[PDB]
């Protein structure tokens, strides 16, 4: 696992697909480990090419993980309101999108009366029961931006082992892949 520390003042890791083979997908799969004391941050954002409305965004609002996405139609929110993640401890998020449906999993190891921190998984599913086929495709994904600096909501804390549709974006940043740029106050562990 590759780990980055996002320090004070923000940082940005950006993966840019080659402009002539940008993926379009029905299903997206995001995994990421992190720790932060922030109650409000953007962690990951995938943007479609300019001129398209499509995006995927992983964030923390009021101390809980949520994902908001748009594949052409409406903004779709899936939140995990029962897991506090802003305690400075390690959490793992797993997000799968399928059309306008999504699964959001948040793993934690809570110490609570003090106890042995066995794992507590919390999964949320979100389905759209709309007769006929809706807009299901995330079109021409252009950038994955990690650290929230371009949303004005900079992440501060650790990020570990990010995985998005096959890409281990942090392993590629650490090895200086030509499609990754790293900026700001960032350090590799
Ligand atoms: C989005 O998900 C819907 C609904 O999923 C179905 O319903 C329940 C919701 O709780 C869920 O438990 C099941 O997993 C189940 O699949 C999908 O809607 C289905 O679409 C297919 C093909 O169009 C139809 O044959 C079904 O009638 C229809 N189900 C219903 C209840 O309308 C939808 O396909 C899916 N979208 C994508 C892109 O995967
Ligand atoms: Ca679309
Ligand atoms: Ca449908």
Coordinates of N, CA and C and ligand atoms in Angstrom, one line a residue:
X1 N 0.8 -1.2 0.0 CA 0.0 0.0 0.0 C 0.9 1.3 0.0
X2 N 0.5 2.2 -0.8 CA 1.2 3.5 -0.9 C 0.4 4.5 -0.1
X3 N 1.1 5.2 0.8 CA 0.4 6.2 1.7 C 1.0 7.6 1.5
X4 N 0.1 8.6 1.3 CA 0.4 10.0 1.3 C -0.1 10.8 2.4
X5 N 0.7 11.7 3.0 CA 0.2 12.7 3.9 C -0.1 14.0 3.2
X6 N -1.3 14.5 3.4 CA -1.7 15.7 2.9 C -1.6 16.7 4.1
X7 N -0.7 17.6 4.0 CA -0.3 18.6 5.1 C -1.1 19.8 5.0
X8 N -0.8 20.7 5.9 CA -1.6 22.0 6.1 C -1.3 22.9 4.9
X9 N -2.4 23.4 4.3 CA -2.3 24.3 3.2 C -2.8 23.6 2.0
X10 N -3.2 22.3 2.1 CA -3.7 21.6 1.0 C -2.7 20.9 0.0
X11 N -3.1 19.9 -0.7 CA -2.4 19.3 -1.8 C -3.3 18.7 -2.8
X12 N -2.7 18.4 -4.0 CA -3.5 17.8 -5.1 C -2.7 16.8 -5.8
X13 N -3.2 15.6 -5.9 CA -2.7 14.6 -6.9 C -3.8 14.4 -8.0
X14 N -3.4 14.7 -9.2 CA -4.3 14.6 -10.4 C -3.8 13.5 -11.3
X15 N -4.6 12.5 -11.6 CA -4.4 11.6 -12.8 C -5.2 12.2 -13.9
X16 N -4.6 12.3 -15.1 CA -5.2 12.8 -16.3 C -5.1 11.7 -17.4
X17 N -6.3 11.1 -17.8 CA -6.3 10.2 -18.9 C -5.9 10.9 -20.2
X18 N -5.3 10.1 -21.2 CA -5.0 10.7 -22.5 C -6.3 11.1 -23.1
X19 N -6.3 12.4 -23.6 CA -7.5 13.0 -24.1 C -8.3 12.2 -25.2
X20 N -7.6 11.2 -25.8 CA -8.3 10.5 -26.8 C -8.6 9.0 -26.4
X21 N -8.3 8.6 -25.2 CA -9.0 7.4 -24.6 C -9.4 7.7 -23.2
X22 N -10.4 8.6 -23.1 CA -11.1 8.8 -21.8 C -12.2 7.7 -21.7
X23 N -12.2 7.0 -20.6 CA -13.2 6.0 -20.3 C -14.6 6.6 -20.2
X24 N -15.6 5.8 -20.7 CA -17.0 6.0 -20.4 C -17.5 4.8 -19.7
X25 N -18.2 4.9 -18.5 CA -18.5 3.7 -17.8 C -20.0 3.7 -17.2
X26 N -20.5 2.5 -17.1 CA -21.7 2.1 -16.4 C -21.5 1.9 -14.9
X27 N -20.3 1.4 -14.6 CA -20.0 0.9 -13.3 C -18.6 1.5 -12.9
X28 N -18.6 2.1 -11.7 CA -17.3 2.6 -11.2 C -17.1 2.0 -9.8
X29 N -15.8 1.8 -9.5 CA -15.4 1.2 -8.3 C -14.3 2.0 -7.7
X30 N -14.5 2.5 -6.5 CA -13.5 3.3 -5.7 C -13.3 2.6 -4.4
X31 N -12.0 2.5 -4.1 CA -11.6 2.1 -2.7 C -10.5 3.1 -2.2
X32 N -10.5 3.4 -0.9 CA -9.5 4.3 -0.4 C -9.5 4.2 1.1
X33 N -8.3 4.1 1.7 CA -8.1 4.2 3.2 C -7.7 5.6 3.5
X34 N -8.2 6.1 4.7 CA -7.8 7.5 5.1 C -7.9 7.7 6.6
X35 N -7.3 8.7 7.1 CA -7.5 9.3 8.4 C -7.4 10.8 8.4
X36 N -8.3 11.4 9.1 CA -8.4 12.9 9.2 C -9.1 13.3 10.4
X37 N -8.9 14.5 10.9 CA -9.6 15.1 12.0 C -10.6 16.1 11.5
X38 N -10.6 16.3 10.1 CA -11.5 17.3 9.5 C -12.9 16.7 9.4
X39 N -13.9 17.6 9.7 CA -15.3 17.3 9.6 C -15.9 17.7 8.2
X40 N -15.1 18.4 7.4 CA -15.5 18.9 6.1 C -14.3 18.9 5.1
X41 N -14.4 18.1 4.1 CA -13.4 18.0 3.1 C -13.9 17.2 1.9
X42 N -13.2 17.5 0.7 CA -13.4 16.7 -0.5 C -12.1 15.8 -0.5
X43 N -12.3 14.5 -0.7 CA -11.2 13.6 -0.8 C -10.8 13.3 -2.3
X44 N -11.8 12.8 -3.1 CA -11.6 12.4 -4.5 C -12.7 13.0 -5.3
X45 N -12.3 13.4 -6.5 CA -13.2 13.9 -7.5 C -12.8 13.4 -8.9
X46 N -13.7 12.7 -9.6 CA -13.5 12.4 -11.0 C -14.4 13.3 -11.8
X47 N -13.8 14.0 -12.8 CA -14.5 14.9 -13.7 C -14.5 14.4 -15.1
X48 N -15.6 14.5 -15.8 CA -15.7 14.3 -17.2 C -15.1 15.4 -18.0
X49 N -14.8 15.2 -19.3 CA -14.3 16.3 -20.2 C -15.1 17.5 -20.1
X50 N -14.5 18.7 -20.5 CA -15.3 19.9 -20.4 C -16.5 19.9 -21.4
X51 N -17.6 20.5 -21.0 CA -18.8 20.4 -21.8 C -19.8 19.4 -21.3
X52 N -19.3 18.5 -20.4 CA -20.2 17.4 -19.9 C -20.5 17.7 -18.4
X53 N -21.6 17.3 -17.9 CA -22.0 17.5 -16.6 C -21.6 16.5 -15.6
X54 N -21.1 15.3 -16.1 CA -20.8 14.1 -15.3 C -19.6 14.3 -14.3
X55 N -19.8 13.9 -13.1 CA -18.8 13.9 -12.1 C -19.1 12.8 -11.0
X56 N -18.0 12.4 -10.3 CA -18.2 11.6 -9.1 C -17.4 12.3 -8.0
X57 N -17.9 12.4 -6.8 CA -17.2 13.1 -5.7 C -17.3 12.4 -4.3
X58 N -16.2 12.0 -3.8 CA -16.1 11.5 -2.4 C -15.7 12.6 -1.4
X59 N -16.6 12.7 -0.4 CA -16.4 13.8 0.6 C -16.8 13.4 2.0
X60 N -16.6 14.4 2.9 CA -16.9 14.3 4.3 C -17.6 15.6 4.6
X61 N -18.9 15.5 5.0 CA -19.6 16.7 5.4 C -20.1 16.4 6.8
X62 N -20.0 17.3 7.8 CA -20.3 17.0 9.1 C -19.8 15.7 9.7
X63 N -18.7 15.2 9.2 CA -17.9 14.2 9.8 C -18.3 12.8 9.4
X64 N -19.1 12.7 8.3 CA -19.5 11.4 7.7 C -19.2 11.4 6.2
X65 N -18.8 10.2 5.8 CA -18.5 10.0 4.4 C -19.8 10.0 3.5
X66 N -19.8 10.6 2.4 CA -20.8 10.6 1.4 C -20.2 10.6 0.0
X67 N -20.9 10.2 -1.0 CA -20.5 10.3 -2.4 C -21.7 11.0 -3.1
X68 N -21.4 12.0 -3.9 CA -22.4 12.7 -4.8 C -21.9 12.5 -6.3
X69 N -22.8 12.0 -7.1 CA -22.5 11.8 -8.5 C -23.5 12.3 -9.4
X70 N -23.2 12.5 -10.7 CA -24.1 12.9 -11.7 C -23.7 12.2 -13.0
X71 N -24.5 11.4 -13.5 CA -24.2 10.8 -14.8 C -25.0 11.3 -16.0
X72 N -25.6 12.5 -15.8 CA -26.2 13.2 -16.9 C -27.6 13.9 -16.6
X73 N -28.3 13.2 -15.7 CA -29.6 13.6 -15.1 C -29.8 14.5 -13.9
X74 N -29.6 13.9 -12.7 CA -29.8 14.5 -11.4 C -28.5 14.2 -10.6
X75 N -28.2 15.0 -9.7 CA -27.2 14.7 -8.6 C -27.7 13.6 -7.7
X76 N -26.9 12.6 -7.6 CA -27.3 11.5 -6.7 C -26.4 11.4 -5.5
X77 N -27.0 11.4 -4.3 CA -26.3 11.4 -3.0 C -26.4 10.0 -2.4
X78 N -25.3 9.5 -1.9 CA -25.4 8.3 -1.0 C -24.4 8.7 0.1
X79 N -25.0 8.7 1.3 CA -24.2 9.1 2.5 C -24.2 7.9 3.5
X80 N -23.2 7.9 4.4 CA -23.1 7.0 5.5 C -23.2 7.7 6.8
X81 N -24.4 8.1 7.3 CA -24.5 9.0 8.4 C -24.2 8.4 9.8
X82 N -24.0 7.1 9.9 CA -23.9 6.5 11.2 C -22.4 6.1 11.5
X83 N -21.5 6.4 10.6 CA -20.0 6.3 10.9 C -19.3 7.6 10.9
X84 N -18.9 8.0 12.1 CA -18.0 9.1 12.4 C -16.6 8.8 11.9
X85 N -16.0 9.6 11.0 CA -14.7 9.4 10.4 C -13.7 10.5 10.6
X86 N -14.1 11.5 11.4 CA -13.3 12.6 11.7 C -12.6 12.6 13.0
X87 N -12.3 11.4 13.5 CA -11.7 11.1 14.8 C -10.2 10.9 14.7
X88 N -9.6 11.1 13.5 CA -8.2 10.8 13.3 C -7.8 9.4 13.2
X89 N -8.8 8.5 13.1 CA -8.4 7.1 13.0 C -8.6 6.5 11.6
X90 N -8.0 5.4 11.3 CA -8.1 4.8 10.0 C -9.5 4.3 9.6
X91 N -9.9 4.7 8.4 CA -11.2 4.2 7.8 C -10.9 3.8 6.4
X92 N -11.7 2.8 6.0 CA -11.7 2.3 4.6 C -13.1 2.5 4.0
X93 N -13.1 3.1 2.8 CA -14.3 3.4 2.1 C -14.3 2.6 0.8
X94 N -15.4 1.9 0.5 CA -15.5 1.2 -0.8 C -16.8 1.7 -1.4
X95 N -16.7 2.2 -2.7 CA -17.9 2.8 -3.4 C -18.0 2.1 -4.7
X96 N -19.1 1.5 -5.0 CA -19.4 1.0 -6.3 C -20.6 1.8 -6.9
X97 N -20.5 2.3 -8.1 CA -21.7 2.9 -8.8 C -22.1 1.9 -9.9
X98 N -23.5 1.8 -10.1 CA -24.0 1.1 -11.2 C -25.2 1.8 -11.8
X99 N -24.9 2.6 -12.8 CA -26.0 3.5 -13.4 C -26.2 4.6 -12.4
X100 N -27.5 4.7 -12.0 CA -27.9 5.6 -10.9 C -28.0 4.9 -9.5
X101 N -27.6 3.7 -9.5 CA -27.5 3.0 -8.2 C -26.1 3.0 -7.6
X102 N -26.0 2.8 -6.3 CA -24.6 2.8 -5.7 C -24.6 2.1 -4.4
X103 N -23.4 1.6 -4.0 CA -23.2 0.9 -2.8 C -22.0 1.8 -2.1
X104 N -22.2 2.0 -0.8 CA -21.2 2.8 -0.1 C -20.8 2.0 1.2
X105 N -19.6 1.6 1.3 CA -19.2 0.8 2.5 C -18.1 1.6 3.3
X106 N -18.3 1.7 4.6 CA -17.4 2.4 5.5 C -17.0 1.5 6.6
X107 N -15.7 1.1 6.6 CA -15.1 0.2 7.6 C -14.3 1.0 8.7
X108 N -14.5 0.7 9.9 CA -13.9 1.4 11.0 C -13.5 0.4 12.1
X109 N -12.7 0.7 13.1 CA -12.3 -0.2 14.2 C -12.5 0.6 15.5
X110 N -13.8 0.8 15.9 CA -14.1 1.6 17.0 C -13.7 1.1 18.4
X111 N -13.2 1.9 19.3 CA -12.8 1.5 20.6 C -13.9 1.5 21.7
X112 N -15.2 1.5 21.3 CA -16.3 1.7 22.2 C -17.4 0.7 22.1
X113 N -17.5 2.7 27.6 CA -16.8 1.5 27.9 C -15.8 1.2 26.8
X114 N -14.5 1.2 27.2 CA -13.4 0.9 26.3 C -13.3 -0.6 26.0
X115 N -13.1 -0.9 24.7 CA -13.1 -2.2 24.2 C -12.0 -2.5 23.2
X116 N -11.9 -3.8 22.9 CA -11.1 -4.2 21.7 C -11.7 -3.8 20.4
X117 N -10.9 -3.0 19.6 CA -11.4 -2.4 18.4 C -11.6 -3.4 17.2
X118 N -12.5 -4.4 17.4 CA -13.0 -5.1 16.3 C -13.6 -4.2 15.2
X119 N -13.6 -4.7 14.0 CA -14.1 -4.0 12.9 C -15.6 -3.8 12.8
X120 N -16.0 -2.6 12.5 CA -17.4 -2.3 12.2 C -17.6 -1.8 10.8
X121 N -18.3 -2.7 10.0 CA -18.6 -2.3 8.6 C -20.0 -1.8 8.5
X122 N -20.2 -0.8 7.7 CA -21.5 -0.1 7.5 C -21.7 0.0 6.0
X123 N -22.6 -0.6 5.5 CA -22.9 -0.6 4.0 C -24.3 0.1 3.8
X124 N -24.3 1.0 2.8 CA -25.5 1.6 2.4 C -25.7 1.4 0.8
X125 N -26.9 1.0 0.4 CA -27.2 0.8 -1.0 C -28.3 1.9 -1.4
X126 N -28.3 2.2 -2.6 CA -29.2 3.2 -3.2 C -29.6 2.7 -4.5
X127 N -30.9 2.5 -4.8 CA -31.4 2.1 -6.0 C -32.4 3.0 -6.6
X128 N -32.4 3.1 -7.9 CA -33.4 3.9 -8.7 C -34.4 3.0 -9.3
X129 N -35.7 3.1 -8.9 CA -36.8 2.3 -9.5 C -37.5 3.2 -10.5
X130 N -36.9 3.4 -11.7 CA -37.4 4.2 -12.8 C -37.7 3.3 -14.0
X131 N -39.0 3.2 -14.4 CA -39.3 2.3 -15.5 C -38.5 2.7 -16.8
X132 N -37.9 1.7 -17.4 CA -37.1 1.9 -18.6 C -35.7 2.3 -18.2
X133 N -34.8 2.4 -19.2 CA -33.4 2.7 -19.0 C -33.2 4.2 -18.9
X134 N -32.6 4.7 -17.8 CA -32.2 6.1 -17.7 C -30.8 6.4 -18.2
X135 N -30.3 7.5 -17.8 CA -28.9 7.8 -18.1 C -28.1 7.1 -17.1
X136 N -27.1 6.2 -17.6 CA -26.4 5.3 -16.7 C -24.9 5.4 -16.9
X137 N -24.5 6.2 -17.9 CA -23.1 6.3 -18.3 C -22.4 7.5 -17.8
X138 N -21.2 7.4 -17.1 CA -20.3 8.4 -16.7 C -19.4 8.6 -17.9
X139 N -19.6 9.7 -18.6 CA -19.0 9.9 -20.0 C -17.6 10.6 -20.0
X140 N -16.7 10.0 -20.7 CA -15.4 10.6 -21.0 C -14.8 11.1 -19.7
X141 N -14.4 10.2 -18.8 CA -13.8 10.7 -17.5 C -12.4 11.2 -17.9
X142 N -12.1 12.4 -17.3 CA -10.9 13.2 -17.8 C -9.8 13.3 -16.8
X143 N -10.2 13.5 -15.5 CA -9.3 13.7 -14.4 C -9.8 13.0 -13.1
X144 N -8.9 12.4 -12.4 CA -9.2 12.0 -11.0 C -8.3 13.0 -10.1
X145 N -8.9 13.7 -9.3 CA -8.2 14.7 -8.4 C -8.4 14.2 -7.0
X146 N -7.3 14.1 -6.3 CA -7.3 13.6 -4.9 C -6.8 14.7 -4.0
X147 N -7.6 15.1 -3.0 CA -7.2 16.1 -2.0 C -8.0 17.3 -1.9
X148 N -9.0 17.5 -2.8 CA -10.1 18.4 -2.7 C -9.7 19.9 -2.9
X149 N -8.5 20.2 -3.3 CA -8.0 21.6 -3.4 C -8.7 22.4 -4.4
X150 N -9.1 21.7 -5.5 CA -9.8 22.3 -6.6 C -11.3 22.6 -6.3
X151 N -11.8 21.9 -5.3 CA -13.2 22.2 -4.7 C -13.2 23.3 -3.6
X152 N -12.0 23.8 -3.3 CA -12.0 24.8 -2.2 C -12.1 24.2 -0.8
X153 N -12.1 22.9 -0.8 CA -12.3 22.1 0.4 C -11.2 21.1 0.6
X154 N -10.0 21.5 0.9 CA -8.8 20.7 1.0 C -8.8 19.7 2.1
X155 N -8.4 18.5 1.7 CA -8.2 17.4 2.6 C -6.8 17.6 3.4
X156 N -6.9 17.2 4.6 CA -5.7 17.2 5.5 C -5.7 15.9 6.3
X157 N -4.7 15.1 6.2 CA -4.6 13.8 6.8 C -3.9 12.8 5.9
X158 N -4.1 11.6 6.1 CA -3.4 10.5 5.4 C -4.4 9.9 4.3
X159 N -3.9 9.6 3.2 CA -4.6 8.7 2.2 C -3.7 7.5 1.9
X160 N -4.4 6.3 1.9 CA -3.7 5.0 1.6 C -4.5 4.2 0.5
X161 N -3.7 3.7 -0.4 CA -4.2 2.7 -1.3 C -5.4 2.9 -2.1
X162 N -5.6 4.1 -2.6 CA -6.6 4.5 -3.6 C -6.6 3.6 -4.8
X163 N -7.8 3.2 -5.2 CA -8.0 2.3 -6.3 C -9.3 2.9 -7.0
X164 N -9.1 3.2 -8.3 CA -10.3 3.6 -9.1 C -10.3 3.0 -10.5
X165 N -11.2 2.1 -10.7 CA -11.4 1.3 -12.0 C -10.0 0.8 -12.5
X166 N -9.3 0.0 -11.6 CA -8.0 -0.5 -11.9 C -6.8 0.3 -11.5
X167 N -6.9 1.6 -11.4 CA -5.8 2.5 -11.2 C -5.5 2.6 -9.8
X168 N -4.3 2.3 -9.4 CA -3.8 2.6 -8.0 C -3.2 4.0 -8.1
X169 N -4.0 5.0 -8.1 CA -3.5 6.4 -8.3 C -2.3 6.8 -7.5
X170 N -2.2 6.4 -6.2 CA -1.1 6.8 -5.3 C 0.2 6.0 -5.6
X171 N 0.1 4.7 -6.0 CA 1.3 3.9 -6.5 C 1.9 4.6 -7.7
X172 N 1.1 5.1 -8.6 CA 1.5 5.7 -9.9 C 2.1 7.1 -9.7
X173 N 1.5 7.9 -8.7 CA 2.1 9.2 -8.3 C 3.5 9.0 -7.6
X174 N 3.7 8.0 -6.8 CA 4.9 7.6 -6.1 C 6.0 7.2 -7.1
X175 N 5.6 6.5 -8.2 CA 6.5 6.0 -9.2 C 6.7 7.0 -10.4
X176 N 6.1 8.2 -10.2 CA 6.2 9.3 -11.2 C 5.7 9.0 -12.6
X177 N 4.5 8.3 -12.7 CA 3.8 8.1 -13.9 C 3.6 9.4 -14.6
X178 N 3.9 9.5 -15.9 CA 3.7 10.7 -16.7 C 2.2 11.3 -16.8
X179 N 1.2 10.5 -16.4 CA -0.2 10.9 -16.4 C -0.6 11.5 -15.0
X180 N 0.2 11.3 -14.0 CA 0.0 11.9 -12.7 C 0.8 13.2 -12.5
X181 N 0.2 14.2 -11.9 CA 0.9 15.4 -11.4 C 0.6 15.4 -9.9
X182 N 1.6 15.8 -9.1 CA 1.4 16.0 -7.7 C 1.7 17.5 -7.4
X183 N 0.9 18.2 -6.6 CA 1.2 19.5 -6.2 C 0.9 19.8 -4.8
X184 N 1.4 20.9 -4.3 CA 1.1 21.3 -2.9 C 1.9 20.6 -1.8
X185 N 1.3 20.5 -0.6 CA 2.0 20.1 0.6 C 1.6 18.7 0.9
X186 N 2.5 17.8 0.3 CA 2.3 16.4 0.1 C 3.6 15.7 0.5
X187 N 3.4 14.6 1.2 CA 4.6 13.7 1.4 C 4.3 12.2 1.4
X188 N 5.1 11.5 0.7 CA 5.0 10.0 0.5 C 5.5 9.4 1.8
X189 N 4.7 8.4 2.3 CA 5.2 7.5 3.3 C 5.5 6.2 2.6
Ligands
LIG1 C1 -30.8 0.1 -10.9 O1 -31.4 -0.7 -9.9 C2 -32.8 -1.0 -10.4 C3 -33.6 -1.6 -9.3 O2 -32.9 -2.8 -8.8 C4 -33.8 -3.8 -8.5 O3 -34.7 -3.6 -7.4 C5 -34.2 -3.7 -6.1 C6 -34.2 -2.3 -5.5 O4 -34.3 -2.5 -4.1 C7 -32.9 -4.3 -5.9 O5 -33.0 -4.9 -4.6 C8 -32.5 -5.4 -6.9 O6 -31.1 -5.5 -7.0 C9 -33.1 -5.2 -8.3 O7 -32.2 -5.4 -9.4 C10 -32.7 -1.8 -11.7 O8 -34.1 -1.9 -12.2 C11 -34.3 -3.2 -12.8 O9 -34.0 -3.1 -14.2 C12 -34.1 -4.3 -14.9 C13 -33.5 -4.0 -16.3 O10 -33.9 -2.8 -16.8 C14 -35.5 -4.8 -14.9 O11 -35.6 -6.1 -15.5 C15 -36.2 -4.7 -13.5 O12 -37.6 -4.8 -13.7 C16 -35.8 -3.5 -12.8 N1 -36.3 -3.5 -11.4 C17 -37.2 -2.7 -10.9 C18 -37.8 -3.0 -9.6 O13 -37.7 -1.8 -11.6 C19 -31.9 -1.0 -12.7 O14 -31.6 -1.9 -13.8 C20 -30.6 -0.6 -12.1 N2 -29.7 0.1 -13.0 C21 -28.5 -0.2 -13.4 C22 -27.9 0.7 -14.4 O15 -28.0 -1.3 -13.1
LIG2 CA1 -23.6 10.7 -18.9
LIG3 CA1 -34.6 2.0 -14.7

